[PDB]
Amino acid sequence: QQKLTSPDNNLVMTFQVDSKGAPTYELTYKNKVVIKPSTLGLELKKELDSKTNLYDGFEVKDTQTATFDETWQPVWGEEKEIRNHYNELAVTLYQPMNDRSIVIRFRLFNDGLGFRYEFPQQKSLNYFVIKEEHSQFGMNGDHIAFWIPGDYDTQEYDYTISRLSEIRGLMKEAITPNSSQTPFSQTGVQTALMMKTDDGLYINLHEAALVDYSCMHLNLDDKNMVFESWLTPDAKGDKGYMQTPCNTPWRTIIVSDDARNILASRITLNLNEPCKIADAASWVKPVKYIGVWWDMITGKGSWAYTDELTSVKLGETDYSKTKPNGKHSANTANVKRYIDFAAAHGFDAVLVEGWNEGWEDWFGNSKDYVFDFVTPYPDFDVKEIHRYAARKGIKMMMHHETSASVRNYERHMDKAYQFMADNGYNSVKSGYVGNIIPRGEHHYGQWMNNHYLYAVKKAADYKIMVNAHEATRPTGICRTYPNLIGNESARGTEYESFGGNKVYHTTILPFTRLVGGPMDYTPGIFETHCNKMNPANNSQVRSTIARQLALYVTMYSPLQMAADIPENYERFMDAFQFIKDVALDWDETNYLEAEPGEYITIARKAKDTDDWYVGCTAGENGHTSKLVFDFLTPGKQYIATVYADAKDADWKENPQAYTIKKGILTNKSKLNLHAANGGGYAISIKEV
Amino acid sequence: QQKLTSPDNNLVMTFQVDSKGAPTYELTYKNKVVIKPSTLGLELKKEDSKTNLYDGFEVKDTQTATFDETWQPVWGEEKEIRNHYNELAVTLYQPMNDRSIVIRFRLFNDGLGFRYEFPQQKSLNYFVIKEEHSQFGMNGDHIAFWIPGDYDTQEYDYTISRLSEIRGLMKEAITPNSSQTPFSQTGVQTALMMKTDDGLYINLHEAALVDYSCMHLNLDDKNMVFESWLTPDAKGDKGYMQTPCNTPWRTIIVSDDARNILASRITLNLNEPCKIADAASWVKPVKYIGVWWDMITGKGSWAYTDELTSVKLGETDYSKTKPNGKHSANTANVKRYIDFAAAHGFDAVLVEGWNEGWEDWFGNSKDYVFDFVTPYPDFDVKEIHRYAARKGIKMMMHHETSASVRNYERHMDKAYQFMADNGYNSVKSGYVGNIIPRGEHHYGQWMNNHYLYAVKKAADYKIMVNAHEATRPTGICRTYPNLIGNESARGTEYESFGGNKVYHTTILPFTRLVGGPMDYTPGIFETHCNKMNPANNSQVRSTIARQLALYVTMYSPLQMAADIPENYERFMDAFQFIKDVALDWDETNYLEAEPGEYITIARKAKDTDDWYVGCTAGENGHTSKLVFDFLTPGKQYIATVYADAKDADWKENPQAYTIKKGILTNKSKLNLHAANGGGYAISIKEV
Ligand SMILES: [Ca+2]
Ligand SMILES: [Ca+2]
């Protein structure tokens, strides 16, 4: 038996090898059980039977302990500086029957535990294939969980809030239709998984540094309340090709008696390798943008240039011989009106989708040669858009939807990134909509994880920033490659056009999806009835206008869209001011209020300023805030503008009802505010 | 009932739909049935009635044409090829699915090709093939020359048996390989060669295997019907299609004379004309030697060091490892090969083992296995370049991928630029091991796309490609003549792995060579492998004279002299034939041919009045009465005859040969005997 304690002494992890030589761990917090005794280990694919066993028959050959305490600065983040402070136990475990050794490394922080497996180079462990990882997390009770279905292919599901014992009965309805989805179990859920216990704890289960390895989901044993690592299989059912020396990703248990401290934890980032982009600070930069986007997402407009053809063949179809469909939003004149608005209002960039040949066939065809990423449609003048944008101090953000055709994207990748450089594009939104090609792979297997990271490492060579939709959900790698400024990789604002997101969605994402990296959520919908874009579309955004403003503060990202069309912003320009003002990068963050599923309220100090921005987002019952502004600087005065729900505001019946109040605040000020149902508020607080 | 006839009237193809609308064809030759009534169609993957693309058809329209044009390959067995056929195109409408296909038939004096065409139309755009059902009904229990149907290797010895005997011989026919997936107890590969009891020779194959999965044949041995059996992808599906598109052609080449099978150019004729406009300025035949046989026999290693349990590229520091003392691809050794190549008029030298990574090359399913650009510490890329260039020798690049295909694609532009920067203009690639991405097979639609992509990209860099382990050829060299070889069959390397059957080279030209040349790597003079490495007791099943013969009887613009220089130096008199023999031809005359038994071929060297002759023979040897009436009237020629000595024998007496020099004219006749596993070679040079 071996004990490890957090620096503050509040957490204790006990490790032991049992009688069958299986490694076991457990974890307590303030003397409460968080993880019950839980085994660790892996089973390997057969090439001898005993070699398949990397889960028991071990003995402790060595232990080492260490303490780390160093502060580092992210290129962009929720605060200027992050402290990485932990006590470590490393245990060398030897398996006589196989004459081989592994190491399990534990790092225990004041806010939780990380563990991983290490496989040293040695005579009898070199090349191996993982059949299953058997990392357990035994729960001490039938907790409340906030979860989406375990799935190898999508995370674009609404959350469910339920007991662990209720997950099974709810899985069928929780799995809604998607273009690519492979659920794996009636009790399978994804990470990060957020839980609230009856004895007042908050527990988050996740992984960190998902590199050269398959994505971990969790399979719940709902009779014993034990979660277990369930990795994503390849086209043959295997779960990772390994070569020593190599490590698994970290597995993390983040725990506190204060839900706010889950949001504050930096465990995920802390467990990633330090920045490998030496010049990152010189070129990696936050981006606020608008886009030719919502037209197509609502169905008002098309990505396609033409409706005349039953299919297209790149290099054969002559688009100049085709009839424009009259709906193609990515045309030069329209694009320039977006640049105009962007530049009028202080935005950095304009995204355009549907600019390149191919879009007629983008959806659900399993098409290999679906795009070339370089050839514009006849009505999109690349160089003139570039000149016009540059004139206005605006950057165009590139769009590389791959339609999940991965070999095809790789073959064009250097040409595509060269085209970006040649044409003044320095960020790209990529996409992987559809089932993966090569066919047989899943979006989150080891094979695709390699692709996503290859795309980002190659981008870094071109000084290009990457925002990858449909990719594996983040696990802190942005620390290592700060040019990964976004993913979607969860259910975003676009689904508010596809029937809606749950009213409580944005009170969950920061506790789950956001752990490991920002999301390109694309907030800022002011006209929430999609039927005003497209009369055939009766979807309604589940939000008030004020809650949309809040999201620029409650959905942290160095990449922030204002997603509505300019004409809609023009109708509510007074509210639009908050989107214009809000910063993208922060020196400090204060988590003021937080309860998963119910409300989140955050105040952040804009980097290199003494201005603060506050947002509150609420669920189905609203939320009353008693805000206390003692985080402001003593003796200073600030001009505060409060953008709040009207008293009769409601996400469904009255979403555009907002108030704007401008006044002075100091560190002695207090405000009482009420977020409507599916409502919220935003405050800018600028030092006089 | 539609009827199509060959230009010379000897072949007749009849077509009709049966009473359930199934497309049905049959083929006769000189009034003998070659193909019994046989059906054509496909079954499609379900997105019920739409899965049927095999019956319910009605003939909507027919069109006929005749084509007769001559064209010139960049390299080949003759200067000019005549493309002469009658064509029938049948539009088939399927009312139940409101869609049409076209089946196009081309009928030559030596056989039939057909393909399916899928026009763009409202009700047929994207579709996935579940199975293709092209039938070839045989008229008897023919003798066949076959290798096991397999998605992953063709490196098998041939078996000669009745169709009815295939099932019982399959188990023994499937020998161990590092990547192999047999599919049927009666599954064989193409090109399949057959000899009938009523005196015909029949070859079943495909042409222009592009954007489609490789076709094998599955024998129904009750009815004697072969049927197309495509190669599945990782999910079991057999081709992603998008209209307008076509299947490759399916070919039945038939004659009452076996020599006419070798003479046929149906396969090339059904491929699209050359797409490399400047091919003739840069695509050139290559005679080569190489640092190669050392490693194949186990005398030397590809690896630089033995002291590591595995390597990681960009982490492993080879300059800090101990050389194993056996790494043949070192500068000094390479320069000696270059010396011998230049001395003897060779074009190039291959070197394998030159690049980081070889320690882990075999069977690890390793992704990042090679980078194709970083030399080991004892291989000085620049020094070897400048030396070879000064000696008038080109280095041939080696890209073994170890079947890690995404890894190769990621490195490919860089690898090709490295070649261009370092004076390499030809590359031998390899795909040894199971394919990565894992789940795909070597011959599926996915990989066929890969091999051709590597070729088309190479052509943009003016690079010639010789791809081992790739899908066996189907005449695409006509379209991209920088594809100057494949192995894609069992080559000489396996003579080091236990031996090839004595009759192997009397079968390949009837099977593997139909569709394109083979990098067979002939020319082993020291046929006992234990002289290279004492632990290898493999013996090449050949005489020295038969090895010489292979420079004529195994056609290829790419020809290796595969033995080590010191072995050639022991037999420099026999070596002279290898030095003299040409690589490219204005004419070819097939003098004698019987599959499994003997092949004798005379060819006229391009732009000369010189001829070269080879005979290769099986287990029983062969006696030729050669008649030289193909030489020019009134001319005199210096002939050098390299023949098996009396009582030469592949097994007991392989190195016994004679050399006789004399004058020949078109009135000359010679009687020659090829030993068991023997043969002979003749150079015939105009005075
Ligand atoms: Ca999406
Ligand atoms: Ca081979």
Residue numbers in the entry:
A (entry chain A): 22 to 68, 86 to 726
B (entry chain B): 22 to 68, 87 to 726
Question: How did the manuscript describe this experimental structure?
Answer:
Here we describe the three-dimensional structure and mechanistic characterization of the enzyme encoded by susB, a GH97 α-glucosidase from B. thetaiotaomicron (BtGH97a). BtGH97a was shown to hydrolyze a range of substrate sizes from maltose to maltoheptaose, and both α-1,4 and α-1,6 linkages. The tertiary structure of BtGH97a reveals three domains; an N-terminal β-super-sandwich domain (residues 1–317), followed by a canonical (β/α)8 barrel (residues 318–636) and a C-terminal β sheet domain (residues 637–738).
The structure of BtGH97a was solved using X-ray crystallography data to 1.90 Å resolution. A calcium ion is present in the (β/α)8 barrel domain; it is octahedrally coordinated by four glutamate residues (Glu194, Glu508, Glu526, and Glu532) and both oxygen atoms of a molecule of ethylene glycol, which was sequestered from the cryoprotectant. Superposition with other (β/α)8 barrel GHs (data not shown), as well as the presence of the four glutamates, suggests that the calcium ion is, in fact, bound in the active-site region of the enzyme. The calcium ion displays high apparent affinity and may only partially be removed using EDTA or Chelex. The addition of calcium to the EDTA-treated enzyme resulted in restoration of full activity; all further kinetics experiments were thus conducted in the presence of 10 mM CaCl2, at which the enzyme had full activity.
